């Protein structure tokens, strides 16, 4: 290109005319592909409105049984094909996937389409499209994105499954089917392999759900019939993310009422929740959920006598106090825990903490005082659930925490994340990149804790209408405590809307299961070696910025770990 | 050929090598692999030691049925050093899928496997996994190094003539080129399907105390259940039915195929598996609980009696009762069980009658009369093979005391006896000697087989600890697989050659049972002997070819 530009257009005029456009903009005569750039992107990219076109190629995926695998379709107009509301409408159609044996992954039960919608300017909200056929408006100078996910049943026959998604530019009012030789066809190939991801999650990830948020936003009084229906809706939706929900009400000095099941242990609904195979751990409340006639002592005695008989009792825990800060708080936990043990001695009490007692240090520095918390609490806490931020980037001080615990007597180390750690550590703050979100569970895996807790999934600012704007609480990084959105904000559905962050939590929990499989076959040192040598994850400040390492890892698990 | 003074005056016997000269280069980026390394194939029944002498390379022509493993070995011996600093050098091994003319495939993961043959106590025995499809092997001067190639044909595979290659490449120190040496594999998959359910129940014990000690897994723990689970699943590929085993006072045994309570979903995943021909039910509790021993037993049998797979149950209660008090504890124990289930099969191992009140004036005659003392409180009479010496004609004397039209069965076992030259699995015994265990079992016509132990090592407290053989026993007795962790980082068990010959033998039984089903007992017996495969306990083929003459004759005559 000369100094004066092609044909005298001036400086830098004509550096690629990326192939002349067709002179017509009529979608009934021009291929969709000459009207709109369409390409695929990996599930770990947060695909902004200004992402640049790439050339479309086929998509080749891998999934085990009981695994959700995902990819994205990006669309950016080249022209107006609807002069009067630019740029135009595209119709999106998907199809069953079919193997050689004639087995199928069906549209609707396995295969789903959602639009990726920005929250605070960042790609985050996944809003359902109509199946099998939907329409999507495309705007000038904007990249618009669809999240495709495929849920493989536990019983699915292995094989190579194949299918197509069809994108057609439409003329709006300026029947037939809209699909034609002018349509653009994206080719899908998924290999289902012999692994079944355990039905019961290997890592209990317990996630809190504010009941006050539900009570206010929906307008449902605690105890009511409508309240019980609303909590039911949330509990059932959340289990598909390989997590263990608990409802949570905060009290005086950060005491907590935490309950997985709002139903008395008597009720048939209690066993339907607690004996669900997908639920790895459930909170039992300390006080009564609904106002009773009994005293709490009296209620808890009778609740525990029932639950301790049931075969799911091994999944129970009590969570009594959120971040005890001072000596009175740590004493209160001992007292409450000992009431519990009098009705059943094998009860598991979960305590979260970032610090020893402020008013009576257990050692001359804060970190050292923190390390001794188990010496103070023993034997009145079983699950020592510590803040990851406390470690900074010192993965080598993990041993300092563990050296104070007694694994051989049922004590366990768990971790949580919250307003810290911050960039460039793994977390779920809005603005954090996709791999950074997924790296939360790579870190959890590497460090060797036996469960995980996240304080909040719906912890918005207060609102009194279902479709009210989602506002983020003051003093916290936006996204902290917020993994899903009300459906009514984005459509007329009552079904929750997932965040990208919740999808990358699930994918991370799927990765954990892969790495646990690899470990069960080749040992701890080899599996640690796989995580690092692939480039997936080296340390809290050093993990992959791209997708490809992740496929290298999951592909090596497939190559080596089949039966 | 050569004169007294040798070629060019090299001295006595110099220049008798007809080997054509070597190349003057040793650079493996320029010299064909075949000029740097001798490579040849051997049969699956040779124990190929480190001084096996090179043969000319030829094509491999194999036969298998559906649901059959077939095998061969690849032997490699360096001719020169191609890595001057670390002799002799490294070769890369690469396998590819096998394809028929119709386009069917036998695949590398699932079908074709490669393992290194490693010596144990100086004898070729352990089969240690190589990486697939590409592995590396260090070769050392003046030594023959050996790879075991096995091909598992799926039950549903299309008949056909499948073809492929294994490629061996000397490395410089992925790298395949025109210099690489190519071995040609041709496998005929024929019509026969080998029954999914083994036709002979071969029950194999697995010591639970060995697992608990060596892997540091507390009996009952969740880690223990995982460890037992891994062993069970791995052993079912060998056409055997495992049982875990703890010995008690005076050689009482607690035996159990499943560690899982009978109501647990995992119990029926094990016990209803089509490959499991017989399973052991424990007399007392595996995992200590609240119910007394009689209340546990009745509850368990009630659940099991109702299941479709209950015809496979048996109870193994005493290992080798030796005096009158032992034979009488068995009768008491059995009779307790018959109160809950009259139809239960009780299995008893023995080599002798009661020594303190003999049943007859000589020990062989006392042994033969054991069923008349135990009846009706044993249904499976499992007797020591060693007691017969080389007398196949005295089997009749055992069977004549049994009431086989009242579901009494005759099974056999081997152990520290019999010894050379009889068939057994003692380290040092020859390949076809190991395989002849099942030839003998077939010819003598018992309806089952038991082996006391497959992991019966001396005691150790770390997974990768040296494997030591128990005192007073021929090494290998009681040991058919090794810990994977001794040989790599893997938790998967390592098979012995002897376990592979056991499988080969069990596959031979299914070939002979097919020929019998078509042509009758007397023609089947004639086949076995007139091919040279097996004449009797001290006379059986020392070479592979008769085994192929036998299998090929079954293919030509039962190809329908
Ligand atoms: C277990 C936890 N306890 C605290 C919560 O109540 C919230 O304040 C949260 C905000 O990030 O921080 C920590 S995470
Ligand atoms: C059924 C058997 N019982 C005995 C076992 O307990 C071991 O002592 C073995 C040693 O070879 O010999 C016999 S075989
Ligand atoms: Cl055929």
Residue numbers in the entry:
A (entry chain B): 11 to 184, 254 to 642
B (entry chain A): 10 to 182, 256 to 642
What's the publication's text?
In Group 2, NgaAt was active against GalNAc-β-pNP and GlcNAc-β-pNP but not against Galβ1-3GalNAc-β-pNP, indicating that it possessed MR-β-HEX activity. Thus, NgaAt is a different linage of β-HEX from GH20. The active site of NgaAt in Group 2 also possesses a cleft shape, and the second β-sheet of the (β/α)8 barrel is longer than that found in the other enzymes, followed by an additional β-sheet (orange). Consequently, the space around the 3-OH group of β-GalNAc in the −2 subsite is narrower than that in Group 1. Therefore, NgaAt was presumed to act on Galβ1-4GalNAcβ- but not on Galβ1-3GalNAcβ-. Since Galβ1-4GalNAc-β-pNP was commercially unavailable, Galβ1-4GlcNAc-β-pNP was used as an alternative substrate to test this hypothesis, and we observed that Galβ1-4GlcNAc-β-pNP, but not Galβ1-3GalNAc-β-pNP, was degraded. Thus, NgaAt demonstrates more diverse activity than expected and possesses OR/MR-β-HEX functionality. In NgaAt (Group 2), apart from these seven residues, W329 establishes a hydrogen bond with GalNAc-thiazoline, and L555 contributes to substrate positioning (orange residues). NgaAt was inhibited by 25 nM GalNAc-thiazoline and by 25 μM GlcNAc-thiazoline (a 1000-fold higher concentration) (orange and yellow). The structure of NgaDssm (Group 3) bore a striking resemblance to that of NgaLy and NgaP2 (Group 4) (root-mean-square distance of Cα atoms [rmsd] = 1.5–2.3 Å), while the structures of NgaLy and NgaP2 are identical (rmsd = 1.0 Å). The additional N-terminal domain consisting of ~80 amino acids, found only in Group 2 enzymes, was not modeled in the crystal structure of NgaAt owing to disorder (orange circle).
